[PDB]
Amino acid sequence: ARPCIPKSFGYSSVVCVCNATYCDSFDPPTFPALGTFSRYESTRSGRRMELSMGPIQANHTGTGLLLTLQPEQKFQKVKGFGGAMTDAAALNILALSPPAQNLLLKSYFSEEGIGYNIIRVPMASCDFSIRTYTYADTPDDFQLHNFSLPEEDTKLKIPLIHRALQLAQRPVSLLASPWTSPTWLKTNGAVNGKGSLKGQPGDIYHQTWARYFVKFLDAYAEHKLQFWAVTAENEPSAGLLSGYPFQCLGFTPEHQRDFIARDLGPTLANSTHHNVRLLMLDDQRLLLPHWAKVVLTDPEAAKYVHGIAVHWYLDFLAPAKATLGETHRLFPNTMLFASEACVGSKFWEQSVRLGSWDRGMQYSHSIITSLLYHVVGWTDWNLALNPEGGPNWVRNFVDSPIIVDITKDTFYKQPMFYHLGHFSKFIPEGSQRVGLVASQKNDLDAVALMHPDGSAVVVVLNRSSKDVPLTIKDPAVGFLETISPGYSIHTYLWRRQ
Amino acid sequence: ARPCIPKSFGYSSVVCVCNATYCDSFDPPTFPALGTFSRYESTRSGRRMELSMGPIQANHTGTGLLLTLQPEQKFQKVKGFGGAMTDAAALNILALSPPAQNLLLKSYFSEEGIGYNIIRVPMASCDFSIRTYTYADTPDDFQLHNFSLPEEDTKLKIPLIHRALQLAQRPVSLLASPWTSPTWLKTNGAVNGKGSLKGQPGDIYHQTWARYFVKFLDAYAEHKLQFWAVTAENEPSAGLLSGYPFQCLGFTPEHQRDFIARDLGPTLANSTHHNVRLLMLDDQRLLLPHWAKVVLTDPEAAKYVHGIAVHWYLDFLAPAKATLGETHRLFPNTMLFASEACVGSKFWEQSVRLGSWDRGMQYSHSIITSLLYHVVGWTDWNLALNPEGGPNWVRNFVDSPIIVDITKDTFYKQPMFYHLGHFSKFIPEGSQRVGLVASQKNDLDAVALMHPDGSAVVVVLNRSSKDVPLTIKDPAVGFLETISPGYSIHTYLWRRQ
Ligand SMILES: *[C@@H]1O[C@H](CO)[C@@H](O[C@@H]2O[C@H](CO)[C@@H](O)[C@H](O)[C@H]2NC(C)=O)[C@H](O)[C@H]1NC(C)=O
Ligand SMILES: *[C@@H]1O[C@H](CO)[C@@H](O)[C@H](O)[C@H]1NC(C)=O
Numbered sequence: 002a003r004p005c006i007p008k009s010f011g012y013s014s015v016v017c018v019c020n021a022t023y024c025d026s027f028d029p030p031t032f033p034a035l036g037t038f039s040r041y042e043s044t045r046s047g048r049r050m051e052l053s054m055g056p057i058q059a060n061h062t063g064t065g066l067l068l069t070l071q072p073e074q075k076f077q078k079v080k081g082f083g084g085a086m087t088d089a090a091a092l093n094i095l096a097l098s099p100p101a102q103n104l105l106l107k108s109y110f111s112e113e114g115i116g117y118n119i120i121r122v123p124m125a126s127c128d129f130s131i132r133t134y135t136y137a138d139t140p141d142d143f144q145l146h147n148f149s150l151p152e153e154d155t156k157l158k159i160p161l162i163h164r165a166l167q168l169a170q171r172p173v174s175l176l177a178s179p180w181t182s183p184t185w186l187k188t189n190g191a192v193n194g195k196g197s198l199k200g201q202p203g204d205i206y207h208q209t210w211a212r213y214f215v216k217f218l219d220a221y222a223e224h225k226l227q228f229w230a231v232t233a234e235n236e237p238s239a240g241l242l243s244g245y246p247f248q249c250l251g252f253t254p255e256h257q258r259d260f261i262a263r264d265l266g267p268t269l270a271n272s273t274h275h276n277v278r279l280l281m282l283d284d285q286r287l288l289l290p291h292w293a294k295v296v297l298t299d300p301e302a303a304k305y306v307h308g309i310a311v312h313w314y315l316d317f318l319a320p321a322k323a324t325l326g327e328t329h330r331l332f333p334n335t336m337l338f339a340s341e342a343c344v345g346s347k348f349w350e351q352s353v354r355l356g357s358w359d360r361g362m363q364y365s366h367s368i369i370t371s372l373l374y375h376v377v378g379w380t381d382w383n384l385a386l387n388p389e390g391g392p393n394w395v396r397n398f399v400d401s402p403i404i405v406d407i408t409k410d411t412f413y414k415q416p417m418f419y420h421l422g423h424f425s426k427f428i429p430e431g432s433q434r435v436g437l438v439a440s441q442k443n444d445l446d447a448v449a450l451m452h453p454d455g456s457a458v459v460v461v462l463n464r465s466s467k468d469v470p471l472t473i474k475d476p477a478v479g480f481l482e483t484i485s486p487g488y489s490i491h492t493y494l495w496r497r498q
Numbered sequence: 499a500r501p502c503i504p505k506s507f508g509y510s511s512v513v514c515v516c517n518a519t520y521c522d523s524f525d526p527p528t529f530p531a532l533g534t535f536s537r538y539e540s541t542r543s544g545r546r547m548e549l550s551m552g553p554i555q556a557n558h559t560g561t562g563l564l565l566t567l568q569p570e571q572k573f574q575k576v577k578g579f580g581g582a583m584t585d586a587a588a589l590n591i592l593a594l595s596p597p598a599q600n601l602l603l604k605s606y607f608s609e610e611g612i613g614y615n616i617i618r619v620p621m622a623s624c625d626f627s628i629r630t631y632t633y634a635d636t637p638d639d640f641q642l643h644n645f646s647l648p649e650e651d652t653k654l655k656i657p658l659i660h661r662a663l664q665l666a667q668r669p670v671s672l673l674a675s676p677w678t679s680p681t682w683l684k685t686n687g688a689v690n691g692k693g694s695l696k697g698q699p700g701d702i703y704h705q706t707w708a709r710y711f712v713k714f715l716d717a718y719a720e721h722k723l724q725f726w727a728v729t730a731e732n733e734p735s736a737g738l739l740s741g742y743p744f745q746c747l748g749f750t751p752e753h754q755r756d757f758i759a760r761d762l763g764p765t766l767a768n769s770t771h772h773n774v775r776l777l778m779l780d781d782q783r784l785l786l787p788h789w790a791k792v793v794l795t796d797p798e799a800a801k802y803v804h805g806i807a808v809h810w811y812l813d814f815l816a817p818a819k820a821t822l823g824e825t826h827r828l829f830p831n832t833m834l835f836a837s838e839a840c841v842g843s844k845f846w847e848q849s850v851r852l853g854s855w856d857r858g859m860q861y862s863h864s865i866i867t868s869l870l871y872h873v874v875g876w877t878d879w880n881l882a883l884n885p886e887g888g889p890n891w892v893r894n895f896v897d898s899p900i901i902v903d904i905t906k907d908t909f910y911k912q913p914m915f916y917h918l919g920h921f922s923k924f925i926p927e928g929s930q931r932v933g934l935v936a937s938q939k940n941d942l943d944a945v946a947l948m949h950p951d952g953s954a955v956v957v958v959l960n961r962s963s964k965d966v967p968l969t970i971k972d973p974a975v976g977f978l979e980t981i982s983p984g985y986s987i988h989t990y991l992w993r994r995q
Contacts, residue, residue: 002700031702034638054641 002026002113005049008413014045014358016404016413021097024104025049025414026113027426032456038481038495041427043419045358045488050419057495059479063472067440070449070457070475072497074436077375079450080338081174082425083119084109084381084402086165089129089392091157093385096407103168105403105412106161109384112170115422118430120162121340121380122228124179124217125151126192127235128247128395129383133192135183136217142183143209148216159224171429174229176340176380177217178283181248182210188251195243197251202259210260211268218274228274232283232310232340233257233265239284246395254288254295257281258302266305278307283340285312286324293328297335309335311376313342315363325374336377342367343382344417345390345400352390352397353404358488360400361416365462365490368424369448372434381421385412423492427458445469445485455498461491499523499610502546502911511542511855513901513910518594521601522546522911523610524923529953535978535992538924540916542855542985547916547923554992558969558977564937567946567954567972569994571933576947577835577875578671579922580616581606581899583662586626586889587881588654590902598907600665602900603658605911606881607666612919615668615927617659618837618877619725621676621714623650623689624732625744625894626880630689632680633714639680640706645713656721668926671726673837673877674714675780677733677745679707684747692740694748699756707757708765715771727775729807729837730754730762735781744892751785751792754778755799763802777807780837783816787825794829805832810839810868812860813847822871833874839864840879841914842887842896849887849895855985857897858913862959862987865921866943869931878918882909920989924955942966942982952995958988 005017005025017025027050033039036057041050094102108114125135130153139147166173181192186206189196199206214231221228233252240251252260261279269275282292289309297303309328325337344360345352354360368379383401390397402418428450437449437459446462463469469485477497485491502522504512514522530536530551539548558564591602605611622632627650636644647656663670678689683703686693696703711728718725730749731737737748749757758778766772779789790806793799806825822834841857842849851857865876880898887895899915902908925947934946934956941962947955956970960982970978974994982988 028701029697031640032638033640034636034643036643037639037641056641056643 002028007047008356010355012354012356012358014361014416015047015356016415017049018411018413019101019104019108020409020411021101021104024108026107029112032496035478035496035498038493040483041423041492043416043423043490044486045416050422055481057475057478057481061472061480063470063480063482065470065472066443066445068447068449068459068471068473069438069440070459070473071436071438072451072476076434077336077372077377079428079430079432079434080378081118081430082379082421082428083117083121083173084384085121085123085341086158086162087123087127087129087383088131088153088157089386090384091153091161092131092392093387093405093407094161095157096405097412098410101410101412103164105385106165106168108403108414108418110165110169110173115418115426116170116429117425118169118171118173119176119378119380120165120173121176121178122158122162123235124177125181126248127180128393130394131392132394133248135181136220137183137213140185143205145209145212145216148213148220150220159221159226162226175226176230176232177228178232178235178340179214179250180235181250182213186210192248194245195241195251197240197256198260202256202263207260207264208268211264214265215268215272215274218272218277228277230278230280230307232280233261234283235341236284236312238288254292258296258299261296261305262299262302266302270305279305280308280310280338280340281306283310283312285314286319286321289324290327290331293332293335297332307336308338308377310338310340313339313367313371314346315342315344315360315367316347321370321374325376329375337375338377339371339379341380341382343399346398353386353388353400355388355404355413356416357400358416361420361490362462362464362488364417365420365423365460366446366464368421369446369460369462372448372450379424420490423460423490427492427494429453432458443469445471457493457495457497459493461485461493463487463489499525502544504544505910507852509851509853509855511853511913512544513853513912514546515908515910516598516601516605517908518598518601521605523604525549525610527609530992532993532995533975535990537980538920538989540913540920540987541983547919552978552980554975555977555979558971558979560969563940563966563968565944565956565968565970566935566937567956567970568933568935569948569972569974573931573933574833574869574872574874576925576927576929576931577833578615578668578927579876579918579925580614580618580670581878581881582618582620582838583655583658584620584624584626584880585628585650585654586883588650588658589628589889590882590884590904591658592654593904594902594909595907598909602882602909603662604665605900605915607662607670609667612915612923613666613668614670614922615666616671616673616875616877617662617881618673618675619655619659620732621674622678623745624677625892626888626890628889628891630745630891632678633717634680634710637682640702642706642709642713645710645717647717656718656723659723672723673727673729673777674725675729675732675837676711676747678747679710683707689745690742692738692742692748693746694737694753695757699753700760704757704761705765708761711762712765712769712771715774719771725774727777727804729777729780730758732780733782733809734779735785744894751789754789755793755796758793758802759796759798763799766802775804776802777805777835777837778803780807780809782809782811783821786821787828790825790829790832794832803832805835805874807835807837808873810836810864811843812839812841812864813844818867818871822873826872834872836868836873836876838877838879840896850883850885850897850901852885852901852910853912854897855913858917858987859959859961859985861914861917862920862957863943863961865918866945866957866959869945869947876921917987920957920987924957924989924991926950929955940966942968953993954991956990958982958990960984960986
């Protein structure tokens with residue numbers, strides 16, 4: 002329907018401007034006849050998910066690199082893509098006037114949008130909140146009667162989550178992650194810094210931290226929202242580092258293991274939410290395969306765990322083979338899921354860089370790499386932030402895909418947003434990654450998956466400056482002749498039958 | 499040269515039998531000397547455009563009826579006259595022996611015939627086809643790889659058009675019209691029934707439908723044929739009716755308006771055929787002025803519409819003033835044009851009355867009405883039918899100026915043929931209707947036009963049983979004393995210098 006309204010801010014590309022009466026959107030998707038492919042392009046130079054089409058001819062006039070689809074080579078199945086509804090995000094969003102709010106949600110969740118089917122939901126305050134609270138801050142309340150939900154959950158997170166699910170293309174799943182417990186179960190009695198839970202797994206401190214997990218669940222359920230999964234903690238490696246500034250609860254791998262085993266798992270198991278899946282190690286990729294080795298090799302924990310959740314900090318190198326690769330090898334039946342990613346901390350980079358293509362590229366390179374190493378789903382950090390890059394009670398240190406300019410009632414869509422969309426919109430839940438063979442060495446990143454209905458989808462990223470001539474072969478349909486422009490991103494689709 | 503060979507089938511008048519060795523034909527056209535007028539005469543009693551000549555008098559003594567030419571009451575200029583090359587027609591025409599054919603084509607297109615200067619051409623199958631087909635029946639071919647012309651076009655319609663042009667000496671203009679789009683573009687997936695273009699204008703369905711016109715014109719260009727104009731759709735209103743039996747595609751006027759502005763207009767504009775004119779509403783009179791108001795008050799639609807096309811059901815009433823007149827008043831610069839007419843649609847009447855005089859009169863009466871109300875030219879329906887009024891695949895049979903009996907290798911020219919001829923032969927493209935006031939109430943239908951060379955033509959029709967004596971005054975030259983025999987049609991021509 003409506004194209005991108007560009008705006009430069011002195012970066013290598015532009016964002017797209019939406020206010021309360023215009024936003025760039027998509028038409029109900031079409032499915033071109035067997036023999037016909039669809040392409041979506043976004044370029045640094047300015048193009049933004051633009052639909053074009055062409056032939057899958059059975060001749061082969063292309064003499065460069067070949068990408069051969071190998072549909073019989075079958076890999077993991079996809080949970081889906083989304084991002085987190087942090088206090089920050091909820092606040093920045095409700096700054097906007099209601100019509101702007103809807104153009105915004107639609108952008109993320111609608112078919113006119115990019116089809117998010119996941120929302121990560123922090124359990125009380127995190128660094129991206131305007132205050133440090135938990136759901137039971139009243140002291141020595143061990144059976145949890147003053148367990149309540151603040152204005153924050155009741156007015157901000159929850160009604161937006163409802164609206165998000167109304168607009169949604171597809172069914173949406175919900176993920177929870179606690180940052181810190183009530184401070185009267187902490188070795189340090191403080192929402193941050195080197196301070197774990199009190200006593201040892203099994204004891205009453207440990208048993209209450211588990212009941213809070215259940216309570217959060219009942220509480221969100223009165224408002225009629227069920228969770229697909231919860232993480233055991235967000236970033237527990239962090240609570241062992243003295244002077245950690247954000248809300249954090251320490252857990253050595255050995256500690257998480259025994260906690261899940263004796264407390265979290267059994268408590269969850271015995272409750273009406275026994276179907277909510279538990280995820281472990283909600284923390285950085287360099288903590289694997291070790292953390293997995295420790296938690297899962299003990300039978301009594303492992304039987305509760307459904308997946309391992311990881312974090313991409315896109316400012317840092319971290320070899321996938323040695324981390325995720327090795328992790329799948331050691332437990333091929335244990336799913337890998339990416340529960341947070343963000344970029345913007347390099348001290349010398351503005352936290353929010355409006356129209357940064359490099360950052361979009363970094364995003365996609367990260368998701369592709371993800372799926373080539375067995376990952377079932379990728380989840381962004383904040384849905385929306387301000388131009389400073391907040392509101393964060395400690396410091397802005399990360400960008401976001403949508404930035405909200407409250408003073409001008411407009412909001413902007415970063416190259417990030419579209420580099421994500423090239424995946425989330427075209428890989429429904431149930432899709433399965435399938436083989437895809439390069440004919441030769443190439444400066445491109447590629448990935449191929451297969452829709453539920455059995456149609457193909459291949460994302461191609463170019464991070465070099467040079468254009469790249471490319472042929473994608475599909476054994477059933479024939480050859481798809483194309484060029485992949487420098488600094489670009491294509492998502493190709495087609496029927497196979 | 500050769501006169502009509504008459505034969506009767508028990509109706510009020512005769513047909514002119516023609517075969518492979520004989521057909522009634524005209525001498526090469528001449529002009530009356532200044533001071534003399536020319537007459538062509540057709541009568542129920544058997545005279546078939548008989549040529550005679552007589553003097554223009556200096557003075558006139560009388561109390562009887564007086565038609566006064568008003569050379570300065572200048573009105574619409576004239577595009578011309580012709581008829582439609584439907585599959586049915588081509589098929590009938592092409593099933594006679596070759597010399598039977600040439601004679602049939604010359605009957606319509608030569609100077610020794612009635613010199614048609616328009617052929618309307620259906621873009622694929624109508625109800626006067628023997629099979630349903632589009633040019634793009636492969637489903638979801640949004641790119642129209644498999645767009646093409648089947649035999650109906652390539653061995654029937656085109657060859658016959660080339661031959662028709664060859665024989666014609668006035669330049670012939672072609673007009674093209676689609677009944678249905680491919681079925682994958684339509685909401686109901688059928689060639690018939692309530693249905694329309696999917697989605698909304700500016701979308702992919704609408705963009706394709708547009709491209710289809712251009713492909714259409716591409717293909718006909720490759721066979722060295724250019725079209726003067728196309729219609730936005732044949733009988734759009736019909737596509738809006740539950741149960742509709744034959745090829746169609748339904749537009750509300752808003753739909754048609756928006757389609758024209760957003761898709762059809764631009765697409766034609768950005769192509770080699772931009773010169774091709776575009777006519778809106780290829781439907782019945784009662785839709786005016788409404789449809790006219792809806793399309794023509796939107797300037798993004800108006801800039802594309804070169805005129806308004808109307809269908810004339812002769813068995814059926816419409817008030818000329820409240821329809822055409824009013825429309826001319828609102829849009830004097832959008833030409834009215836008649837794209838179709840037929841007799842024998844109405845449920846209770848026979849499709850073919852061979853030799854029906856009553857039918858010819860119904861023709862000229864209403865072609866004169868057309869001219870009186872700013873219609874710039876006229877296009878009959880099927881050039882040739884069979885004695886059933888077909889073939890037609892929903893059995894939607896109706897009459898035709900020429901009826902072909904293949905078992906006898908013989909075709910029959912009807913009163914309609916000559917009734918049309920009285921106009922088509924004597925009103926070259928560029929003629930301008932002028933005023934003609936009567937001196938008193940009277941049973942005649944008349945019309946006056948001036949040719950491009952400056953000389954006069956007046957058609958006089960008598961639908962009463964009684965001879966009317968009358969005089970035509972033209973101040974430049976004098977008086978024509980004549981009689982309109984009862985149940986007759988006369989065409990008069992004279993120089994003015
Ligand atoms: C076609 O029509 C012509 C004219 O009607 C027919 O020839 C005439 O009819 C009879 C038969 O010989 C003769 O008395 C006349 O000499 C003919 N008249 C003229 C003007 O030619 C002829 O029979 C028909 N042709 C065919 C092939 O059936
Ligand atoms: C369309 O046309 C091409 C070339 O003429 C042909 O090889 C192909 O098989 C056709 N496709 C379909 C779907 O009919």
